[PDB]
Structures are given as C-alpha cells and as structure tokens.
Design a protein around this ligand. Structure first.
Ligand SMILES: Cc1cc2nc3c(=O)[nH]c(=O)nc-3n(C[C@H](O)[C@H](O)[C@H](O)COP(=O)(O)OP(=O)(O)OC[C@H]3O[C@@H](n4cnc5c(N)ncnc54)[C@H](O)[C@@H]3O)c2cc1C
Ligand SMILES: Cc1cc2nc3c(=O)[nH]c(=O)nc-3n(C[C@H](O)[C@H](O)[C@H](O)COP(=O)(O)OP(=O)(O)OC[C@H]3O[C@@H](n4cnc5c(N)ncnc54)[C@H](O)[C@@H]3O)c2cc1C
Ligand code: SF4
Ligand code: SF4
Ligand code: SF4
Ligand code: SF4
Ligand code: SF4
Ligand code: SF4
Ligand code: SF4
Ligand code: SF4
Ligand code: SF4
Ligand code: SF4
Ligand code: SF4
Ligand code: FES
Ligand code: FES
Lengths: 343, 255, 281, 343, 281
C-alpha cells in the first residue's frame, strides 16, 4: 500500500474535493458530549477527534428503519422498494467500527446475500481514522485496534499532517486525482507515526488477555452476579440498539386505511424486549430479565470462525450509553474473577 | 363495510380531532361506515349495534358507567383509545377523594347530575385492544384501523420510547442532563417526540404491560441523580395514576 | 432474482380439517417454472406469508418426489395462524423457498428407522415416513410412533390406521398411543413405554425424534438404556423465526462455546449437539 | 462442550484404551533435551509435560519426504501412490501446533484440495494439552494460546487429574466408550483450572501488542539490522524445516537405474536455499542472503484473511533451534521499536 | 478425479521452429472428452510435464475458441526445456489444467486495446490478440506492439507482417520494432517511443503489457504521461512455479501488507497493484 502525506493545511481542501464525488457522512456535534454521523454541508463543523458515535456506522448499510416491500392485497404481490444510491464516502470510521462493518458483511453477505445490505456496501468508501482511547474503549482486548482491509483510505494522524494509507482501489483514484494537494512521506513522519501508535497503545485503560471467556462463561451460567446486574438493568435495549454488531431486527406489517395497500417495515430489536424470544402459547425461551441479560452477554461473547473475532468489537458504546452504568467489561472481568477472586 | 362507532366520554376530544386531522380519513369512508361520531356526524345512531367501538375518554359519571355498559352490550370488539380510556389518563392523577375535589373546585354547589371518580374503562368493561398515546399517534390509528379492516388485530407493543429515540438518533436526555425522562418504561409509537425536541418524556403512552415495566431500576437511576422518592413517584403515575404496580415497585427499591 | 427475501405465489388446492385445533392444506405454485423445478429435503420448513399480516414457518409434511405439491399442517394458536385458518381453497398466499437442513435421509440407506413423534412435531416425521415409504427398497423395517395427549389430537390417525394392515405386511410397526386418555379405546403409555417394543436392531438403527423437548430427556434415556446408537439420533427444535436466512437473530440456541442458529444449523440436530450444549432443551 | 474429568490414576488406562482405536503418536524423548512425535508402544515413555517437538505435527499430514507418483516413460502414465491409513490419534498437540494445523488446512484444502493432505487430515484425531510456557514461547503475541476448534479432546491439566473438553462427535464417542474411567467436574476443579490458566497467562516472558508489525515492516525494509542478522545467519533452513506453518516444498524427479521406474519425490524446502527463487538465465529474485532472510521474515509476518492470524504461530522453534541463536521475536521488536528505541 | 496434481495426456501434433532460440508446438489431448470439454481464459498458463524430467509453466498462446488445440512457444534455456526441444511431432507428454487468472478480456468489450509486448512475453499477448481478432465485434481499434532486441528475436514476425496489409483495413496498427541492433531494416527505438503513435483514445483504452519488468517503469511513465487511464493497465510477471495450485510457495511476490501468490492472484495483475506493492518489478 502507498503512503501519501497530507499536510494539515490541505485537510479541509481534500475534504472539499472529496465532496465532489458524493455525499459525505462525518461525525458532527449533536449535543454537549454526544457525536453522531450526520450528513456534511459545511466542512468546518466536522470534529476529527471524537470519542464515539451514538449510532454505529452500520446505519448506512443496515438502515435503522427500512421499508422492505410495499404490497397490494388484491392480486397479492410484494414490490421491493430499492432505490439507486450514489457512492457515499463515510469519513471518520474507527478501527473497531471497521471491524464491526466487516463482521456485519460476514453475517449479511454469507450464503444468502441481503440485497439491501449489498447494494449499499458495494457503493461506500470507508475512511479509517486512528482513534485515541478514552476511559471506555477496549478495542485491544477484542483485537480490533488496527485493520488491514475494508478501508479505501486510512487517515493516521500526524503532528504535521495526516498520513494516508490507500490500501485499496478507488483510494488510489481519489489520491491520484487530488495529488496536487498531497505530498510524500519519509522517515521524519514515519518515526512520529510510530511514536503516536506507541502512545495510543500505552494509553489503554485495560490490558489483559481474554482468551478463555467463551469457555468459562458456560461454567458460570448461574452466577449471582447475573441476578444482581439484571436487577440493576432497566431493559431499555440501548446496549444493543447502539451496538455495531447486532444483526437482530423485527419485521412488522402496516396496512393503510384503504385496506388494500401497505408496506413491510424492518427495525432493530433487542433481546431485552419481551417479544424477541416468544413462541405460541405464551412460552418464552428467555422469560426472566436475567435470562435475556445472560443471553445478550453470551451472544456478544460468541465466536465467529469466518474471521476469528468475537462479535463484540470493544467499542464501549454499551457500557458508556447504558443509563444504569452497568459495566460490560467490569461484569465480564468479574466472570473471570479479577474483582472478587473467591475461588 | 365495518360498522365503526366513536363514543365520547369526558375527554378533551384530542383523539377524535387527531383522527380528523389525518387526511387518510377520506379513504376510510369508502371502506367502512360510521354509526356514531357525534362531533362529525349529526344523524348518528347512539344505540345501534356496531362491530368495533372506539371508546374515547375516562369514566367520571354514572351516566358514563351505564353508557360504557351499553357499549359493551352492543359491540363485538371494544377498543380503548388514548390514555384516558386505557388507564384513566390525567383525569385520575389526583389520589384525593371525589368529595375533596368537589369541595375544592365547586365548593358547596350542587348539580342535578351525579359525578364520579375518574377510572379507566378497563375497570368496568372488558377492552380487547388499545391504541396508546395522548393523543394517539396517527401511525397507531393507521395501523389499528388497517389491521381491523383486513380482519386481524393489532398486537400489544412492549418496546419503550428509547427504541425510537435510539433509532432516530436523538441525544439521550437521561445520560446527558439527568432530567426525569420516562422513556425506558413507556410504550413506543410516538417516534420519540419529546426526547427529539429536548424535553423529558412524561409517560405520554402509559407503562409497558405484561409485567415488563421495571420501575425499580428506573427509580434507582432517578435516585442516583438526586431525586427524592416522592418526587420520583409523582413524576410517574402522571398518566399511570391508577396502576397498582408502580407504588409497590418504587417502595421495593426505597425499602 | 438475487433478492433473498423474495417470495413466490402459491394457491391452496384443497383444505382438510385434520382436528379441532389443526388443519391440513394442499399447495401448488402458480408459476409453472417454479412448480416443475421446486424441490426440498424432508425436514426443511417454509416461510408462509399471508399478505399484510406476517410470515410464519411451517415444516413441510409431504413427499419430495411429488413435484409441485406440498402440505402444511397448521394449528390456530395466534394472529397469523388465525388468519391462515380462514383461507379457502383457491386463494393466494406468498411462500418462500425451503430453508434449513432436513433429516439426513441421504446418509440413511437400508438401516432400520425409529421415527418417534410426539405432539405437534409429527409433520416433519410424517414427511420422512412418506419419503421412506416412497423408496421402501432402500430401507429396513421402520417403526413410526405418533403420540398425543388429548386422544382426539392423534394427527393423521385415520391415514395410519388405514395403512396399518399394509404396514404390518411390509414389516412396518406403526404405533399410536395416548398419554392422558385412560378412557380412549387404544394404547395407553408414554412413547418411552412403547419404544421398548421396537423391531429395529439397535446396532444398525437410525432414530429421528420430533415434538416437545420436555420428553426429549426421557426418550434419550430410554433409547440409550436399550443400547441404541447415540451417533444415530436426530431431533428437531423450534425457536422464533422471522427471516429464515440467518439474519433475524431470534432463533439463537446454545452457549458461547457453540452458539448455533436453527435456520442454518438445523432444524435437524444431533444427539451429541443436544447433550453438548445445555439449554437446547 | 462437555467437561469430563480424568483422575490421574486413570490417565495411562485411558491411553491404553485409546491405543485400541489406532496408532498413537505421542511426544517422546529422542535426546537429552529434544522432543519428537515418535510412534509409541509402551505408554510409560510418554512425556506429558514437554516444551516443544523438534518436528511440528504437520509431518503426519504434510509428510516430510513423500512420493507423489510412480511413473513409466513408455506409455507415459503417472500412478498416484496413496495408501489407506487407519485412524491415528495424535496425543499432545499444543495450542500453537493446533493453530498451525488449522493454517495448513486453510492452505492445503482451499479451492484445490490436496488429496494427500486431505486423506490424512480426515482420519486424524487431535488431542490438545495445556502446555506451560518456557523461555521461548510467544503464542500470546500472535494470539494462538487457546484453541476453539480443531481438537477432539483437550487435556487441560488439573492438580487432581486431567480436564477433558470434547468438541466433536468422535471425541464424544471415544469418551463415552470408556466413561467408566471418567468422572464429572464440579467447582472444586473449575477453580483449580482457573488458577492454572491464570498462572499460564502470567508466566509468559513477552507481553506486548504486536499490532502494526506488518505495515511497519515495509517501511523498514532497508534496515541495517537485516544485513547484520543475515551476516550472522548460517543459511541452513532449520528455521523453516522445523516451522509448523511453512507450506513450501521442492519437487524432484528420480529415475531408476534403467529405463522405466520413477518416483516424484516431494520434500520441504526453505527460502535460504539458493534454488528456491531461481529462474532461467541465473536470475534470482532474492539473490543476496539478506534478501532471502527478509523474504522469510515478511512471509511469516503475512496476513491470512481466512483466519485473521499471522502465519507465524509463535511456537518459538525458529528462535530456539537456530544454531546461530538468531532471535526472531528480538528482531521483530527491533523493527517494532521495543528493542531499539532510536527514531 | 479429485487429485489436484493430476495430469492429462497430450500429443504434439506439429512442431514449428519459430526462431533459433524459441520453438512453437501444436498440442491436442489424447482423451476425446478432455479435448472437447477443455477451455481456458486468455492469459492462463499450463504446467507442461516431461515424464521423468520435471514440470515447467508455459503460457497458452492460442485462441480459446478452437477447442482441443493450443500452442506453446518454448525457449531452450535449461534442463527441462532442452529435453522439450527434442520432442518430435506425435510424441506424448503430460499436461495439467489451466491455472491462474487470464487477461480480463470479458470486461474489455467496447473499448480500444493497446497490446504492448516485449521480449518473450509476446505469447500471452499473442493469445489475447488472437482472441480479439476472432471476436472483432466486441472491441474497437487495437494496436499490437511486439518488440525484441536482436531483430531475429521478433516472435511471429512473418505472421504479423503477412496480416499487416489486411490489419490496416481493420483499424489494427500492428507495430514491430527493435531496440539494440540498427542494422535491421525496420523500425528502431525503445517500445515506449512507439506508443505515442497509438490510435487508441486514452479516455477509453485498456492496456495490456507483458515481458521483462525492467521496461515496466518506463512504459508506465510513458502511458501515464500521455493521459492513458492507469485503472486500465494490466501486466504479467513470472516467478518460480512447481505446483500451480498455491502449495509450492516459490511464486511469492510483494510485502507483508500485500503478499500475493502469482498462481492464485495472477498472473495478470493491475497497475495499482504494481505501484502499491514494491518488489513486484
Ligand atoms: C422450524 C419450525 C417449524 C414449524 N413447523 C410447524 C408445523 O409443521 N406445524 C405447525 O402447526 N406449526 C409449526 N410451527 C409453529 C408455527 O410456526 C407457529 O405456530 C406460528 O408461527 C404461530 O404464529 P402466530 O403469529 O400465530 O403466533 P404469534 O405469537 O401471534 O406470532 C409470533 C411470531 O413469531 C414467529 N414465530 C416463529 N416460530 C414461532 C413459534 N414456534 N411459535 C410462535 N411464533 C413463532 C412468527 O413470525 C409469529 O408470527 C413451526 C415452527 C418452527 C420454528
Ligand atoms: C507464468 C509463466 C509463464 C511462462 N510462459 C512462457 C512462455 O510462454 N514461453 C516460454 O518460452 N517460457 C515461458 N515461461 C518460462 C518457462 O516456464 C521457463 O523458462 C522454464 O521453467 C525453464 O525450465 P528449466 O528446467 O529449463 O529451468 P531450470 O532453471 O533448469 O529449472 C528450474 C525450475 O523452476 C521452475 N520454473 C518456474 N518458472 C520458471 C522460470 N521463469 N524460469 C525458470 N524456471 C522456472 C521449473 O519447474 C523449472 O524446471 C513462463 C514462466 C512462467 C512462470
Ligand atoms: S474502541 Fe478503539 S477503534 Fe473503537 S472508537 Fe475507541 S479507539 Fe476507536
Ligand atoms: S443499556 Fe443498560 S439498562 Fe438498558 S437494556 Fe442495556 S444493560 Fe439494561
Ligand atoms: S446481543 Fe442480542 S440483539 Fe445483539 S446480536 Fe446477540 S441476540 Fe441479537
Ligand atoms: S457489546 Fe458493547 S462493546 Fe461490544 S460491540 Fe456491542 S456495544 Fe460495543
Ligand atoms: S387521551 Fe390524551 S389527547 Fe385523548 S382526550 Fe385524553 S388527554 Fe386528550
Ligand atoms: S432521552 Fe429518554 S427516551 Fe431517549 S433514550 Fe434517553 S431515556 Fe430513552
Ligand atoms: S416521548 Fe413520552 S411524553 Fe412525549 S409523546 Fe412520546 S410518550 Fe408522550
Ligand atoms: S507458543 Fe508455547 S505456550 Fe503457546 S501454544 Fe505453542 S507451545 Fe504452548
Ligand atoms: S536456523 Fe538460523 S542460521 Fe539456520 S537458516 Fe534459519 S536463521 Fe539462518
Ligand atoms: S517463510 Fe519461506 S519456507 Fe516458510 S512459508 Fe514463507 S516462503 Fe515458504
Ligand atoms: S516463524 Fe518461528 S515462531 Fe513462527 S511459526 Fe515458524 S518456527 Fe514457530
Ligand atoms: S432464522 Fe433468522 S437468524 Fe436464524
Ligand atoms: S504457484 Fe505454487 S505457491 Fe503459487
């Protein structure tokens, strides 16, 4: 891959020339300390250094509220409502978010390729940015700190600019078209990039191995910690609706006033809601609140053999955005015994 | 054509007006016939046998008691619309006796008719399906009316307002400023209007049924923000006033 | 074309009122091109879609050799099922393609089969029984045990009792027993009480079980106590499904060590899979 | 997965009853401090605790000296020499070796399945043992410390015996046939297993995150450390012939004394040998010794997208068995900067 | 059947002494089923095997439409190819199936092609030239530039000069030039300087290059200086190969970031792959 140096006086110029290609989605301020991917109109409002987004970048490919079909009851037919989408450039995707998008690609493009997801994944440019760990981020524990594939551009921050790793095609096209604004890297910036990476690795709050969580979690399925934390839990589904790797959704039918026209709607549904695991006769396969809580923990602590990564990418959205401040990493380390160590 | 009747109890007529503010009501006329919508129709028959009865308003009169009993006798599927007809609404917020309220408001004056303490419709007759809200969302009206016209019935919703608050992308009031937002315990369908506009939810659609309304954890997180037990109890029961579960759930966490 | 959620049109040919709470339906796709090429493995389910109501899964209970036709035994226990029950022959319904892996009938050849059905789960086992009967040459003696609990709820009781003489002629022991009907003039006892009288040789027997998982432990203990091979036991379990293509996330089973999904890792499972991950039952 | 406990007084009994299934390949001593997978006859000579084997367990599937075909020039025909192999049970495969076998499965069973490798991988039972890190192992750096799939029985050592994890129907049948010798685990042994795993994690010599080695390796291709270490290198290929994940081999034609009896022989070949990258006209694409040294380092530091693991499993055979004692992890950390800290 | 190292018997129908250092051969498989069912993509190489000596890769230089026949231009520069050079017509050798990814001819429809061949690499470019000639309707005007260094080293010079008059009537400007020898009565200069005369429109041109990689940098600079699209440039590089199925490990190209293997990731590459992975040249 080619390393192209972008001096800081040309970053906004490159973003303006990037807006020529298509719509730009970058993290902007929405509240006092909340970030979200909003569509860019004025480039100066983009916050380059942001902790995390309130919604993961999966909303562009796995839309939060999507109309699958519109139907007519008479002569029963379902018409798929799919619209052509121009190539959009998602600027400011963390490494953890990039791995989450890869995981959702392995979930949604496997065996049966979802058309709605594929049509939006084939026309998107992911630009990765080197994050800085705050008090919640633990992407090193789940091994999502650095990525090799999935990004067409990687903006690695430098003291005197931005180091751009192209990595993939069409990144070459963008860089070659705007090569007037770009420069060439030498050891001067390489040493600074290495020092920044060393500082980033050293700044993580947690540093321990999590090899045997998937095995030990089954031995301690009936821990009193589950009961206590579930009774502390509010069952609002925020930990899943903001999660980047939750594939679950709920399909509902809406029929108009005429009684002959309607549409089918898809939205994200969490485990905490009652009707996620319900069958006929009022039987629920995770009836109690602790049952659904443990189901979420076990499911996020599963193993994806396609790429060897656990479905949790360590973004920290679940622990940060939980109203009850239930620590995911604290609970999971207490499963290991780093907090109690009774046996 | 399904025979549809809208019977008005003591209410602000917000539910009927919202049903009138939607332009899709013009398409309901070809597909169904209305027997009792007095605010709209004058030739309404107030005692005809109907298929689906949309009851609006709370029960605050003996005349309303006999009216809702007549409705139950003269209707197959009875639909309670709005917080007033589903859980008593804001008309049942005060726990003081009816005589105390009468002395406070009207003093010693006497009227020919007989008043009554406000109660939900579920206390007198068996309601089948509900359309939650205050006023119920036009989405809910469309959904319930269309499902009834097909020949099926809408399902009870168990997801909180936080679902639409997190889908729409509105910032969380509770995690940011700690205001008393009743999101995690009140059913969705309003597309997070209040947290979208920056005001805390006030239980606009009522508490989640099927015993999946964990008031204890919400009371705990309100207490961690500094609210007193009485303040939290008063913040709840604004629209969930006649719910016997809330007091026990809060006193459990404040035991 | 490439849309995985896409459906196909199918019309109900004949309705057959099976019991009070179940009904049997006959289907054939409107498109001749789909009808002449559609095929399935015994055990795979179909996402039946009523327009404007919802999508529900029903296991196919027909013989795969009969191209263009299949049967769905549906019970009215909820909203979509109640709407389905009102469907008359000569009406339209959207059906999605087969999903999941059926019973391993391709690996089965010549060995004796112990098909033990309980409650509602008779439909996949009815399908595998019809498949085995349509190719009776490549199988040994087979025992089909269908059980219920209210007596009248013996699914396909008339069809089995009509074929009872021919089954006994063809080395087939079909047994129907009730669990909570002392007054019913028939066989009383649990399915475990009747699998002890199985004609199948335990050394070379494959077993297929379906129905409520609360009797799964008892039937497993009874089968393993008689020397039946645990490597040839296969069951079917149901969870909530809304997609059938592995994206709904509702049908999640197992633990963190083995987090199976039924639409892709079933619904036909294995004995060591059942005992390996607790919580499947 | 089921957890079955084997008390230490029944370990040799289980090994003897396992010899019924087929040939047993266990680590036995060949010299004073060298271990190898020799076919075992007397169970008492097996060393349960051993650092590493001189040859990786790939010799059972990827045989060292294998005859592919025997040919006859007259009526030109190649007859593949493949013999039926009874199911052999490989006892004592460490986690790093298990991941190496998985990597070789990805290499040799992708797109074009190698018949010789597949016929031997189908009929082999892998038994994993929780080894203890000596002063060479760095499996945690490459994330090959705990195995999820590939093994049938996992012998985790316990103070009162051996904890056996079963992850396949073959292992289930093997354990159930001799279930008389086996017991059931409770928290008493689970806590001991937890303590043993904690000690194993804490006993590693190296603990650092090897995140950006692949990218930084290309930047420092011109490092003088390459020249120095290459001049120290002896070019004997021991680091590759003992490596568990080296897929390279050499194909040679041997013709008998007269006319027609040939065999095509396949043997493991290394980069350091001159003729590994030679083309016609005497042109070599890695002519110098430092070129082949760097080629080996870069190739072992490649990325396998099918698994997410670098091809090196961290077994430490290359750094321990090198006669010149050239460190591998030392050189890599010199490139990474944890050993030099210059720029 | 499933053996990946399996070979097929083939008879050399006719030998043709192309030059002093190269020779052209015509092949046809002995098995009629293999002969009729065989097919290949322009650019895929073949593992020619002399019994008792070894296996060498030679790129196919024939039109894939002509089933059952292919040509291999081989030069004698070592042991196996010296043995090959003595093969008389009608003799039998062993050959393995086509390997690697050929030139993207299927995506090259409807635009002009610039085929620049240097030195030995004319054979795959000859194959794509013949494929384009046999499918002239799918392609626009083409320019086949074949170059050498000693005049007589021009491969297929007689065939190209014979077709030159006819090719000029089909918008085909085939150009031949030498680099070192001035005594040859013909075009002189490096292959780069003759691409300024190319008739292909740079906005809608795909370019294929083959041969020695030392001139690759110069030809890349010349192509990019004339406005030709870098996204439509494809080259061929050779390394040591002994298996062709990804297990030999000898044909490794690139760095740790991008470690390609030619038999699976080529042998036809892309311009951005070449410039983003130093060491390929
Ligand atoms: C693999 C599989 C095979 C089945 N085979 C048969 C069969 O052969 N015969 C038969 O009579 N029934 C069968 N069922 C059960 C049948 O699918 C349910 O009775 C039906 O889905 C009930 O839907 P409902 O809308 O009426 O229930 P509601 O509770 O009103 O709806 C809940 C929704 O959950 C989903 N769901 C998925 N699985 C179930 C389930 N088991 N129970 C309830 N809801 C479910 C549906 O989308 C359903 O609409 C099968 C179920 C599964 C999972
Ligand atoms: C993809 C590809 C396409 C080719 N196409 C042609 C073509 O169209 N025409 C042509 O004349 N030549 C072509 N060659 C070159 C030809 O394959 C070699 O000249 C041949 O392998 C020489 O073998 P040797 O035993 O005489 O060389 P030696 O050096 O004596 O043997 C070394 C061994 O290395 C292997 N090897 C693989 N690639 C090469 C290579 N490039 N050079 C040398 N050995 C190699 C062979 O098995 C060979 O036997 C091609 C090579 C490659 C890799
Ligand atoms: S967890 Fe890591 S990748 Fe994710 S936002 Fe935080 S620093 Fe970035
Ligand atoms: S965000 Fe916290 S309180 Fe809400 S459901 Fe998740 S764990 Fe429970
Ligand atoms: S945690 Fe819950 S919502 Fe998220 S993927 Fe798992 S089952 Fe689905
Ligand atoms: S479980 Fe929590 S930390 Fe893990 S991916 Fe989901 S939101 Fe992020
Ligand atoms: S339910 Fe709400 S909108 Fe309707 S009458 Fe009562 S207060 Fe007004
Ligand atoms: S603002 Fe209110 S409704 Fe929105 S997420 Fe927070 S608690 Fe839920
Ligand atoms: S957010 Fe709460 S108060 Fe506001 S409309 Fe919705 S339910 Fe009513
Ligand atoms: S590297 Fe060492 S400690 Fe790690 S698995 Fe391999 S042998 Fe065991
Ligand atoms: S073992 Fe050591 S001396 Fe021998 S080739 Fe490898 S690095 Fe060089
Ligand atoms: S290090 Fe050398 S011998 Fe080992 S796989 Fe790589 S190229 Fe082959
Ligand atoms: S490079 Fe060295 S440490 Fe890595 S797998 Fe090979 S022998 Fe083991
Ligand atoms: S069937 Fe939808 S996720 Fe399993
Ligand atoms: S051709 Fe054998 S490894 Fe690439």
């Amino acid at each position: 891959m080619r390393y192209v140096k972008l001096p800081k006086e040309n970053t906004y110029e490159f973003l303006e020339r990037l807006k020529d290609w298509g719509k730009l989605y970058a993290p902007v301020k929405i509240s006092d300390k909340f970030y979200d991917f909003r569509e860019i109109d004025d480039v100066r409002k983009i916050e380059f250094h942001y902790n995390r987004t309130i919604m993961p970048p999966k909303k562009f490919f796995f839309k939060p509220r999507e109309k699958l079909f519109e139907f007519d009851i008479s002569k029963p037919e379902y018409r798929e409502v799919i619209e052509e989408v121009e190539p959009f450039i998602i600027f400011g995707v963390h490494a953890c978010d990039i791995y989450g998008l890869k995981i959702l690609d392995t979930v949604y493009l496997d065996e049966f390729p979802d058309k709605y997801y594929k049509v939006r994944r084939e026309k998107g440019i992911i630009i990765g940015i080197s994050c800085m760990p705050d008090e919640y981020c633990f992407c090193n524990l789940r091994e999502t700190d650095f990525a090799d594939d999935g990004f067409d551009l990687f903006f690695h921050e430098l003291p005197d600019g931005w180091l751009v790793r192209v990595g993939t095609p069409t990144g070459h096209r963008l860089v070659d078209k705007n090569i007037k604004l770009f420069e060439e890297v030498t050891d001067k910036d390489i040493c600074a990039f290495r020092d920044f990476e060393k500082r980033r690795q050293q700044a993580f709050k947690y540093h321990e191995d999590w090899g045997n969580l998937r095995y030990l979690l089954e031995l301690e399925m009936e821990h009193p910690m589950w009961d206590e934390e579930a009774d502390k839990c509010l069952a609002c589904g925020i930990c899943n609706t903001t999660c980047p790797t939750c594939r679950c959704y709920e399909v509902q039918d809406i029929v108009n006033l005429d009684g002959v026209t309607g549409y089918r709607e898809r939205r994200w549904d969490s485990c905490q809601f009652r009707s996620h695991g319900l069958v006929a006769g009022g039987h629920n396969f995770r009836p109690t609140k602790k049952d659904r809580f443990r189901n979420r923990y076990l499911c996020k602590n599963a193993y994806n053999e396609k790429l060897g990564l656990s479905y949790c990418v360590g973004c920290g959205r679940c622990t940060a955005f939980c109203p009850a401040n239930i620590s995911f990493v604290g609970n999971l380390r207490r499963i290991l015994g780093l907090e109690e160590n009774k046996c | 054509k399904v025979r549809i009747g809208f019977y008005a109890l003591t209410s602000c007529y917000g539910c009927q007006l919202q049903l009138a503010m939607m332009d899709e009501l013009l398409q309901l006329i070809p597909n169904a016939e209305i027997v009792c919508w007095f605010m709209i129709d004058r030739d309404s028959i107030e005692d005809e046998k109907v298929d689906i009865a949309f009851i609006e308003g709370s029960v605050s009169t003996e005349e309303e008691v006999e009216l809702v009993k007549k409705i139950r006798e003269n209707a197959k599927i009875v639909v309670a619309v709005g917080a007033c007809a589903v859980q008593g609404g804001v008309q049942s917020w005060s726990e003081k006796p009816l005589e105390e309220l009468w002395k406070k408001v009207y003093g010693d004056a006497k009227v020919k008719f007989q008043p009554k303490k406000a109660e939900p419709v579920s206390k007198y007759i068996k309601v089948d399906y509900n359309i939650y809200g205050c006023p119920p969302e036009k989405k809910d009206f469309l959904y319930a009316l269309g499902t009834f016209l097909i020949g099926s019935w809408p399902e009870d919703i168990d997801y909180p307002v936080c679902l639409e608050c997190r889908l729409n992308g509105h910032p969380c009031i509770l995690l940011e400023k700690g205001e008393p937002c009743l999101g995690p315990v009140t059913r969705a369908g309003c597309n997070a209007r209040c947290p979208g506009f920056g005001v805390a939810c006030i239980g606009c659609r009522g508490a989640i049924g099927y015993d999946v309304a964990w008031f204890d954890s919400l009371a705990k997180v309100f207490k961690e923000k500094g609210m007193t037990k009485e303040e939290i109890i008063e913040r709840m029961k604004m629209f969930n006033g006649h719910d016997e579960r809330v007091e026990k759930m809060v006193e459990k966490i404040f035991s | 074309n490439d849309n995985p959620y896409a459906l196909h049109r199918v019309k109900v040919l004949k309705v057959y009122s099976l019991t009070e709470t179940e009904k049997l339906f006959l289907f054939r796709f409107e498109d001749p091109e789909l009808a002449e090429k559609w095929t399935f493995k015994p055990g795979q389910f179909v996402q039946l879609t009523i327009p404007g109501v919802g999508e529900v899964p029903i296991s196919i209970c027909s013989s795969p050799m009969r191209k263009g036709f299949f049967e769905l035994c549906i019970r009215k226990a909820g909203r979509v099922t109640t709407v389905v029950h009102r469907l008359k022959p000569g009406d339209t319904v959207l059906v999605r393609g087969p999903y999941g892996n059926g019973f391993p009938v391709d690996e089965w050849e010549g060995m004796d089969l112990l098909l033990i059905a309980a409650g509602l789960g008779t439909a996949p086992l009815r399908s595998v029984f019809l498949y085995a009967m349509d190719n009776r040459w490549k199988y040994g003696n087979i025992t089909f045990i269908n059980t219920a609990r209210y007596g009248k709820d013996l699914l396909f009781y008339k069809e089995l009792e009509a074929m009872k003489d021919l089954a006994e002629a063809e080395n087939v022991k079909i047994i129907q027993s009730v669990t909570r009907d002392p007054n019913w003039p028939g066989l009383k006892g649990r399915p475990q009480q009747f699998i002890v009288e199985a004609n199948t040789n335990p050394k070379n027997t494959a077993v297929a079980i379906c129905g409520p998982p609360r009797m799964y432990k008892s039937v497993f203990e009874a089968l393993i106590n008689y020397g039946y091979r645990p490597e040839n036991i296969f069951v079917t379990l149901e969870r909530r499904m809304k997609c059938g293509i592995g994206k709904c996330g509702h049908c999640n089973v197992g633990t963190s060590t083995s987090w199976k999904y039924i639409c892709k890792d079933g619904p036909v499972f294995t004995y060591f899979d059942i005992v390996s991950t607790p919580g499947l039952l």
